[PDB]
């Protein structure tokens, strides 16, 4: 969770709260589920972070979004 949370942390979206730790947390699993090791599911949550900031739209609904796409088609990674 330090990686994901430093990303964040230090690209102008504020605290990680609590509820978006926990949101997160869900999502490493969920990856899981269908097959992404917990690195692979991390390294996805960084890279949707990286788009969410080069769009301007540092929120957790923009990434959210981003992640159902990506899970849904089955990426790993
Ligand atoms: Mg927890």
Same mark, same amino acid.
């Given at each position: 969770?330090?990686?994901?949370?430093?990303?964040?942390?230090?690209?102008?979206?504020?605290?990680?709260?609590?509820?978006?730790?926990?949101?997160?947390?869900?999502?490493?699993?969920?990856?899981?589920?269908?097959?992404?090791?917990?690195?692979?599911?991390?390294?996805?949550?960084?890279?949707?972070?990286?788009?969410?900031?080069?769009?301007?739209?540092?929120? /957790?609904? /923009?990434?959210?979004?981003?992640?159902?796409?990506?899970?849904?088609?089955?990426?790993?990674?």
């Amino acid at each position: 969770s330090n990686a994901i949370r430093s990303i964040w942390e230090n690209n102008g979206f504020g605290l990680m709260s609590s509820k978006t730790m926990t949101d997160f947390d869900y999502w490493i699993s969920d990856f899981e589920k269908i097959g992404a090791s917990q690195k692979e599911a991390e390294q996805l949550i960084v890279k949707a972070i990286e788009i969410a900031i080069d769009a301007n739209a540092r929120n /957790y609904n /923009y990434i959210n979004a981003i992640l159902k796409d990506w899970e849904q088609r089955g990426f790993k990674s």
